[PDB]
């Protein structure tokens, strides 16, 4: 759960957009949760 948040979602687009969901808040975070 450290290398990838567990209450967390991955939406990786081959177009070059790594945007992630927070399944807890229903919020979309572009920011790496491990950086802060």
């Amino acid at each position: 759960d450290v290398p990838l948040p567990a209450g967390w979602e991955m939406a990786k687009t081959s177009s070059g957009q790594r945007y992630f969901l927070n399944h807890i808040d229903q919020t979309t975070t572009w920011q790496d949760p491990r950086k802060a």
Partner: peptide, 9 residues
Amino acid sequence: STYPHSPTS
């Protein structure tokens, strides 16, 4: 587990 749409599409 779920696919939304890019917030900056």
